[PDB]
Design a protein around this ligand. Structure first.
Ligand SMILES: Nc1ncnc2c1ncn2[C@@H]1O[C@H](COP(=O)(O)OP(=O)(O)O)[C@@H](O)[C@H]1O
Ligand SMILES: Nc1ncnc2c1ncn2[C@@H]1O[C@H](COP(=O)(O)OP(=O)(O)O)[C@@H](O)[C@H]1O
Lengths: 403, 82, 106, 435, 201, 32
C-alpha cells in the first residue's frame, strides 16, 4: 500500500473573504494562519496593528457590501497587502481558491476572475461557493449551511455538493443587528466610549459608579465612521464575552432570577447585565417584539431554515434536515446552538431525522469556509478543475461553465 | 502519610486525563492485517478506509445515498397490472 | 383509495420504501440509522506490541500513504481495557454482552 | 495413529432416557438386562453416596463382560478415575497382596485440588521514597515504604509494598530491568530473568532472559490438579530434601512400595477432609474394575470382603469368567465362579447371556465398520455362520487378515472367497483340538 | 449497547500515530539506508483538456507517471443529437430546439442531476418546468435516439403521484399528525386483538 | 363487540381520507 491515490498539495492559497474578518492561508493546512479585520483604514492600512494607530483621517470602509465585493480598488489593495506581508509569496507562483457567496452576480464574478488573471497573473484559479466549502469542511455533500455572518443569516442548502440557489433565504438578522441593539442599550443605560485608542489610563471604579480616567491629547479623529468602528469593536467584545442567547420563550420570570455576570468597559466602568443580557439575542429567533422595529415582519433562524427547506424539492429535504450545518460567528454565542436545535425540533415535522453537527465546541465554525477550501484544494481529482492561465488567455474567460 | 497518598493519587489521576496512547507501532501494525472470529467461529477481514480506487470499467453504479434515507431497494415482484 | 394508488406500472422496476424507521446516510448504524456501511464502523481491536484493548477503532488511510487508526468512546472506555482477558483467551459478563467477542486479533 | 485396539467400538451403555436397553446402544449390542444393571450401578457411582459396594459381572466367555465394563467406564467419563486391574497383578514379589489391593483401591479414588494464588509480575523499577525516621523514636534515616514499578505488557503499575521485603529484593539479583514473581501473602520475590527486549543477539547465555508478562500486573492464577489418594500416599511416603539421600548404592533401590495403614488412613484422610470442607479440594471416588477375580488367592478375598466394609472403599466391578472351580490357595475347596461363597454374598451378580447369532452378525459388522473395511453380504453371512460355529472372537479376528488378503488380491471389499481362504489358513482351537 | 458508527469523529476520542521512538534501538535499522530524492517537479495531467502544467511532490525516480487521478474523469453517457435529428425525431410543440439544447447542456454539466438542473434551470428564457417533466423529456429523447440508432419505460405519472403525496404528508400539521399516530396505534391494537383471537381459536 | 366494533368502524372510516397515509400507501420510487 503506497497510497498513490492519497492526495495532492499544489499551492492553492485559499482566501476566504468575509464581511467581519478576512481569512487566508495555504492549502493542506487545517487552520488559516492569516486572520485580520477586513475593513481598511482608508485615508490604505489593513492590518490588526496598522488599523489601530492614530493618523490624519483613517476612514474605515468594508469593500464587501452585503457579502458582495463592490470597491475593487480596496479589494485589490487588501489582497496585495495580505500577500506581501503575511504570505511573502509571489502572486504568479501559486494558484488561488478564493470563495464566494451563493448570490454572486455573473458580472461581478467575471470581474473578479479578470482581476485575478490580469493584475496578479496567478498560474490557476477556482472560485467555489462558501456554502459548498462549509459543507466539505464537515464532510457533508447534503445539508443546510446556516450561515450567520456579521451582515446576513442564510440557511443555504446544498445538493450533492451543489448549492440550491433558489433555496437561499437572505435574512437581515446578523451580527450587525446585535451590535446596533447593544449600542442602543448602552446609550440608554450609559455612554458608549472608545477603546483604549484614546483612553490614556484607567482607575479603580466601584461597580455601578461613574468611572474616571485621563484623556489622550492625540489627533481628534474627526471621522465619526472610524469612531463608529472602534465602538463596534468593543460592542462585539461585549457580545462575545457576556451576551448569552435565551433557551426558552424568554419569559420575564426566570431571567430576573438567574446569576449575575460582570463586565469592565475600556475605561474601567464596571456594570452588570444579568437581568437583560439575554434580551438582545431574541430577534435572531423571534423577530416579533424587537424594540428597534416593532412593526417588522422577519423570519427567525428556525423560520429561515424551515423556509429554505420548504422552497426546495421534497426529495432532498430528508438529507437537508438530517445534516443541518451551523456556521458563522453569531453561533459561538452561549446557548445559541442549543436554542436553535430546540426550536428546529419543535418546529420540524416529526418522523424526519434532525441532527445538529457537533462543531460548536471550537471556534473553527468561522473558519469552516477556509477549512473546506483547503480540503478541496488538497484533493487530487480536483486538480483538473482549476481555471488555468491558458483557459483565460485563450479568450474564453468564462467561469460560469467551468466554475 | 494519608495526605501524601491522597495527593499522589490525585497527581497520578491528572496524568491519566491527558492521553492514554498516541502511537501505533508502525513496525508491524502498519503492514500487518487484522482478523477476528465471532462467537460462531466465522472469519472476516478488517476493512481499512482507503481513498476512492481508480475505476477500470463502467462498474460502481451511481447509488445516490441521500435518496436511501427513505428507500431501501427494489423487489422483483410487483402489482403487475395497468 | 384516492388518486394516490400504486395501480400504475410499466416495464420498469420500482424501489420500495422502508416504514416505521427512517434511515440515514451509510455512515450511521443499521440499528438506529440504515444501510450502515462497514467502512464507517468502529470495532474493538487489539494492538500488536501492546497487550491492551484500545477500544472501538477503525483503520483509515491518511495523507502521504500513512495508515491511521481512529478510535471512539463508549461504556466509560474502561471496561474495554479489561476486555483483554476475553480476547486473549459485573465487569465480566458485560464484556461478553456488550460485544460478540468480535475483537480484531493482531 | 488411531491404533485400533481389540474392542474399542464400545462407547457407552447406550441406555435410553427411560433407562431401558436398545440394540444400537452406542457400539454395544444385546445384553439388555446386563446393560440396565450397568446403568443402575453407574447411576449409583454418579450419586457418590455409597462406598465399599462390589458388583460381579459373571457370565460365560465371550459375553463381552470387559466390553460392557469399558462401556460403563467411558460413560463415567474421564472426569472420575477408572483403574483397571487383573487378578494376576495382585501377585507381587516385593509388596504383599493386600497392600497392592489397598493401593489399587486408593488409585480408584480421585481428588481434585484447586489452588488460587495472587501474584504480581513485570519489569521492576525499584525506588525507595525517603521518609522521616521512626516518629516514635529519635531522628535519622528510615524507609516506611518501598515502591516497585512493575511494568507488564499491558501497562505499568507501581506497588507500594511493605518495607520489610527489602531483604528479599537484595537477596536475589533483582535489578532494574528483570521480571520478578511476587506473591500477595508471602511476598517472597523469585526473579524469573531479564527481559528478552535486552537479550542482544551477541550475548551468549540461556535461562537468564524471559519474555515480558502478558496481561495485567495483578494476576489471580487458578489451577486445578487431580491426583488420586494413592498419589498423595506415595508423595508423603518417600522423603525429599537433603539428608544424604543423593547416595546411589544404599538408596537407588527405590521399590520400597511397602506401606502401613497408619499413614494410609488417619492423617491423610484428615487432611483430605480438611481440604474438602474448607473449599480447597473436592473428593471424586472412582471405580476399580477387577477382571479375572477368580485368579486371586483366598488370602486376597478374605481381605477384599473386609476392605469393602470400610466407608472409604470405592466401587469395585468384579468380572469372573470361570465357573465352579477350586479357590486358589485352598485344598480342593470348590466354590461358584472360583470365588469364596462368603464374598459372592457381598457382590451383585450381573448375568450375561450368550449372544444370539443375529447379535454375532451385528458385532462382526460393527467391528468391520470400526476397522474401516467393507464386507459383502455373503462374506458377512459366512463370518456370522463361522462365529456361530466356533467362538465369536475368532470371526472378528478374521476381518483384518481377510482385508489385507483382499487388498493384495486387487479387490477392495472382503469377498466370501477371502474369508473362506482365511478360515483354512487360520482356524480356531475347537478345530485345533484334533491332535 | 453495541459498536459505534461515526463519519468524522466523536467527542473525546483520539487516534494513535506511527512510531518514531527508540532511535537507539533502531539506530542501525535506519542508518544503513538513505532517502529517495523528492523533487518539486512539474506534472501535466492529461485530463486538463488544455496545455496547462502544474507542480507536485514526486520522487525523481518516476519523472514520468503523468497523473494517477487522471483515470477518474469518466464523463456520463449523454447522447449528442444534431439539428436534423431533433427536427425529424425530437420535434415537440411545448418544447423547442433551444430549450432542449439548454436542458442537455445542463445535464452534461451537472452529470444528470435533475435536481440541480431544475435549480439552475433558466426559468426566464423558458417557462417554468418541473423536475419530473425534465426527467420525462430527457428519458424520452434518450429512448428515441437509442431506437433510431438501431432504456426502460419512464412514467411521469408516477412522479406526479409520489412528490405531491409526500409533500402533503410532510405538511402534516402537529394535531393531525398526532391523530394519525393515534390511529396507527389503534390499528396496531386491533391487529394484536386479532392475533389473540386467532391464537385462542 | 359492544365497543370494539364501533372503534374498528371509526378507524376504517378515518383510515385514509384521500390516500395520504404515513403507515403505508406510499408511491414507489422510480429507478435511474
Ligand atoms: N459575508 C460573510 N460571509 C461569510 N461569513 C461571514 C461574512 N461576514 C462575516 N462572516 C463571519 O461572521 C463572523 C462574525 O463575527 P461575530 O459573530 O461578531 O463574532 P462573535 O459573535 O464570535 O464575537 C466572522 O467571524 C466571520 O467569519
Ligand atoms: N455386544 C457386543 N457388540 C460388539 N462387540 C462385542 C460385543 N460383545 C463382545 N464383543 C467383542 O468381543 C470381544 C471381547 O469381548 P470381552 O469383553 O473380552 O469378553 P470376554 O472377556 O468374556 O472374552 C471384543 O473385541 C468385542 O469386540
Amino acid at each position: 500500500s503506497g497510497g498513490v491515490y492519497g492526495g495532492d498539495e499544489v499551492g492553492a492559497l485559499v482566501f476566504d473573504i468575509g464581511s467581519y474578518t478576512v481569512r487566508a492561508g495555504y492549502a493542506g493546512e487545517d487552520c488559516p494562519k492569516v486572520d485580520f479585520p477586513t475593513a481598511i483604514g482608508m485615508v490604505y492600512y489593513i492590518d490588526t496593528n496598522a488599523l489601530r494607530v492614530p493618523r490624519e483621517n483613517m476612514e474605515a470602509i468594508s469593500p464587501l457590501k452585503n457579502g458582495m465585493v463592490e470597491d475593487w480598488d480596496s479589494f485589490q489593495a487588501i489582497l496585495d497587502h495580505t500577500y506581501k506581508m503575511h504570505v511573502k509569496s509571489e502572486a504568479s507562483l501559486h494558484p488561488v481558491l478564493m470563495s464566494e457567496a451563493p448570490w454572486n452576480t455573473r458580472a461581478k464574478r467575471e470581474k473578479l476572475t479578470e482581476l485575478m488573471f490580469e493584475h496578479y497573473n496567478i498560474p490557476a484559479f477556482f472560485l467555489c461557493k462558501t456554502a459548498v466549502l462549509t459543507a466539505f469542511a464537515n464532510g457533508r455533500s447534503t445539508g443546510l449551511i446556516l450561515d450567520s455572518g456579521a451582515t446576513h443569516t442564510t440557511a443555504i442548502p446544498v445538493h450533492d455538493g451543489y448549492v440550491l440557489q433558489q433555496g437561499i433565504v437572505k435574512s437581515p438578522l446578523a451580527g450587525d443587528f446585535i451590535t446596533m441593539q447593544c449600542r442602543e442599550l448602552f446609550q440608554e443605560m450609559n455612554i458608549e466610549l472608545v477603546p483604549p485608542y484614546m483612553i490614556a489610563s484607567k482607575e479603580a471604579v466601584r461597580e455601578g459608579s461613574p468611572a474616571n480616567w485621563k484623556r489622550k491629547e492625540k489627533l481628534p479623529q474627526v471621522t465619526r465612521s472610524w469612531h463608529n468602528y472602534m465602538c463596534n469593536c468593543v460592542i462585539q467584545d461585549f457580545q462575545a464575552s457576556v451576551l448569552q442567547v435565551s433557551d426558552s420563550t424568554y419569559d420575564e420570570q426566570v431571567a430576573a432570577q438567574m446569576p449575575t455576570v460582570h463586565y469592565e468597559f475600556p475605561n474601567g466602568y464596571n456594570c452588570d447585565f444579568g437581568a437583560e443580557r439575554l434580551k438582545i439575542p431574541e430577534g435572531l429567533f423571534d423577530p416579533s417584539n424587537v424594540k428597534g422595529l416593532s412593526g417588522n415582519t422577519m423570519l427567525g433562524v428556525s423560520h429561515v431554515v424551515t423556509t429554505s427547506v420548504g422552497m426546495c424539492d421534497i426529495d432532498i429535504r430528508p438529507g437537508l434536515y438530517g445534516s443541518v450545518i451551523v456556521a458563522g460567528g453569531n453561533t459561538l454565542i452561549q446557548s445559541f446552538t442549543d436554542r436553535l436545535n430546540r426550536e428546529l425540533s419543535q418546529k420540524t415535522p416529526p418522523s424526519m431525522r434532525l441532527k445538529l453537527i457537533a462543531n460548536n465546541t471550537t471556534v473553527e465554525r468561522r473558519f469552516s469556509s477556509w477549512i473546506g477550501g483547503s480540503i478541496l484544494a488538497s484533493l487530487g481529482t480536483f486538480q483538473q478543475m482549476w481555471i488555468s492561465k491558458q483557459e483565460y488567455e485563450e479568450g474564453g474567460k468564462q467561469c460560469v461553465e467551468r466554475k | 502519610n494519608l495526605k501524601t497518598l491522597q495527593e499522589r493519587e490525585a497527581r497520578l489521576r491528572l496524568e491519566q486525563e491527558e492521553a492514554e496512547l498516541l502511537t501505533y507501532t508502525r513496525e508491524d501494525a502498519y503492514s500487518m492485517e487484522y482478523v477476528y472470529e465471532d462467537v460462531d467461529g466465522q472469519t472476516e477481514v478488517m476493512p481499512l478506509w482507503t481513498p476512492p480506487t481508480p475505476p477500470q470499467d463502467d462498474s460502481d453504479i451511481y447509488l445516490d445515498s441521500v435518496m436511501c434515507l427513505m428507500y431501501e431497494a427494489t423487489p422483483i415482484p410487483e402489482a403487475k397490472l395497468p | 383509495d384516492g388518486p394516490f394508488a400504486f395501480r400504475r406500472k410499466a416495464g420498469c422496476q420500482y424501489y420500495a420504501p422502508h416504514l416505521d424507521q427512517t434511515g440515514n446516510w451509510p455512515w450511521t448504524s443499521p440499528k438506529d440509522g440504515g444501510l450502515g456501511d462497514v467502512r464507517y464502523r468502529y470495532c474493538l481491536t487489539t494492538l500488536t506490541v501492546p497487550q491492551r484493548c484500545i477500544g472501538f477503532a477503525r483503520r483509515r488511510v491518511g495523507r502521504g500513504g500513512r495508515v491511521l487508526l481512529d478510535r471512539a468512546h463508549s461504556d466509560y472506555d474502561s471496561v474495554f481495557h479489561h476486555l483483554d482477558l476475553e480476547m486473549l483467551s459485573s465487569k465480566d459478563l458485560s464484556q461478553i454482552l456488550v460485544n460478540i467477542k468480535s475483537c480484531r486479533w493482531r | 495413529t488411531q491404533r485400533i485396539a481389540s474392542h474399542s467400538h464400545v462407547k457407552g451403555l447406550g441406555l435410553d432416557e427411560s433407562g431401558l436397553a436398545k440394540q444400537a446402544a452406542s457400539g454395544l449390542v444385546g445384553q439388555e438386562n446386563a446393560r440396565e444393571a450397568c446403568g443402575v450401578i453407574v447411576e449409583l457411582i454418579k450419586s457418590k453416596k455409597m462406598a465399599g459396594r462390589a458388583v460381579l459381572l459373571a457370565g460365560p466367555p465371550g459375553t463381552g463382560k470387559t466390553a460392557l465394563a469399558l462401556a460403563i467406564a467411558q460413560e463415567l467419563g474421564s472426569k472420575v478415575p477408572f483403574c483397571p486391574m487383573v487378578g494376576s497383578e495382585v501377585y507381587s514379589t516385593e509388596i504383599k497382596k493386600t497392600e497392592v489391593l489397598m493401593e489399587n483401591f486408593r488409585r480408584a479414588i480421585g481428588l481434585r485440588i484447586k489452588e488460587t494464588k495472587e501474584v504480581y509480575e513485570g519489569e521492576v523499577t525499584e525506588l525507595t521514597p525517603c521518609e522521616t525516621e521512626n516518629p516514635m523514636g529519635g531522628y535519622g534515616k528510615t524507609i516506611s515504604h518501598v515502591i516497585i514499578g512493575l511494568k507488564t505488557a499491558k501497562g505499568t503499575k507501581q506497588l507500594k509494598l511493605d518495607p520489610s521485603i527489602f531483604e528479599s529484593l537484595q537477596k536475589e539479583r533483582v535489578e532494574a530491568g528483570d521480571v520478578i514473581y511476587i506473591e500477595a501473602n508471602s511476598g517472597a520475590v523469585k526473579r524469573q530473568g531479564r527481559c528478552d527486549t535486552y537479550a542482544t543477539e551477541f550475548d551468549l547465555e540461556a535461562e537468564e532472559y524471559v519474555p515480558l508478562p502478558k496481561g495485567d500486573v495483578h494476576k489471580k492464577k487458578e489451577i486445578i490438579q487431580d491426583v488420586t489418594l494413592h498419589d498423595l500416599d506415595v508423595a508423603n511416603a518417600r522423603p525429599q530434601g537433603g539428608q544424604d539421600i543423593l547416595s546411589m548404592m544404599g538408596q537407588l533401590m527405590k521399590p520400597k512400595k511397602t506401606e502401613i495403614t497408619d499413614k494410609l488412613r488417619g492423617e491423610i484422610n484428615k487432611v483430605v477432609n480438611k481440604y474438602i470442607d474448607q473449599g480447597i479440594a473436592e473428593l471424586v471416588p472412582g471405580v476399580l474394575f477387577v477382571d479375572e477375580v477368580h485368579m486371586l488367592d483366598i488370602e486376597c478375598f478374605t481381605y477384599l470382603h473386609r476392605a469393602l466394609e470400610s466407608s472409604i472403599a470405592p466401587i469395585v466391578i468384579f468380572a469372573s469368567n470361570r465357573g465352579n472351580c477350586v479357590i486358589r490357595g485352598t485344598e480342593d475347596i470348590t466354590s461358584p465362579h472360583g470365588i469364596p461363597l462368603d464374598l459372592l454374598d457381598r457382590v451383585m451378580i450381573i448375568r450375561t447371556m450368550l449372544y444370539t447369532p443375529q447379535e454375532m452378525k451385528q458385532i462382526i459388522k460393527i467391528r468391520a465398520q470400526t476397522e474401516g473395511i467393507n464386507i459383502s453380504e455373503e462374506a458377512l453371512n459366512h463370518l456370522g455362520e463361522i462365529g456361530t460355529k466356533t467362538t465369536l472372537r475368532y470371526s472378528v479376528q478374521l476381518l483384518t487378515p481377510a482385508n489385507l488378503l483382499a487388498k493384495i488380491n486387487g479387490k477392495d471389499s472382503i469377498e466370501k472367497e477371502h474369508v473362506e481362504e482365511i478360515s483354512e489358513l487360520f482356524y480356531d482351537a475347537k478345530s485345533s483340538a484334533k491332535i | 449497547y453495541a459498536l459505534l458508527y461515526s463519519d468524522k469523529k466523536d467527542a473525546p476520542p483520539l487516534l494513535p500515530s506511527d512510531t518514531g521512538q527508540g532511535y537507539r534501538t533502531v539506530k542501525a535499522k535506519l542508518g544503513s539506508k538513505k532517502v529517495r530524492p523528492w523533487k518539486w517537479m512539474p506534472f501535466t495531467n492529461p485530463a486538463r483538456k488544455d496545455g496547462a502544467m502544474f507542480f507536485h511532490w514526486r520522487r525523481a525516480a518516476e519523472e514520468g507517471k503523468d497523473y494517477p487521478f487522471a483515470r477518474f474523469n469518466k464523463t456520463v453517457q449523454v447522447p449528442v443529437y444534431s439539428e436534423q435529428e431533433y427536427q425529424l425525431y425530437l420535434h415537440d410543440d411545448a418544447w423547442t430546439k433551444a430549450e432542449t439544447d439548454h436542458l442537455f447542456d445542463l445535464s452534461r454539466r451537472f452529470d444528470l442531476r435533475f435536481v440541480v438542473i431544475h435549480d439552475r434551470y433558466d426559468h426566464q428564457q423558458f417557462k417554468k418546468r418541473s423536475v419530473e417533466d425534465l426527467k420525462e423529456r430527457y428519458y424520452h429523447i434518450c429512448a428515441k435516439l437509442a431506437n433510431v440508432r438501431a432504456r426502460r419505460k419512464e412514467q411521469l405519472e408516477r412522479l406526479y403521484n409520489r412528490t405531491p403525496e409526500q409533500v402533503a404528508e410532510e405538511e402534516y400539521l402537529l394535531q393531525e399528525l398526532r391523530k394519525i399516530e393515534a390511529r396507527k396505534k389503534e390499528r396496531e391494537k386491533r391487529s394484536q386483538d386479532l392475533q389473540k383471537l386467532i391464537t385462542a381459536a | 363487540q359492544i365497543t370494539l366494533e364501533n372503534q374498528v368502524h371509526q378507524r376504517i372510516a378515518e383510515l385514509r381520507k384521500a390516500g395520504l397515509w404515513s403507515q403505508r400507501r406510499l408511491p414507489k420510487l422510480q429507478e435511474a
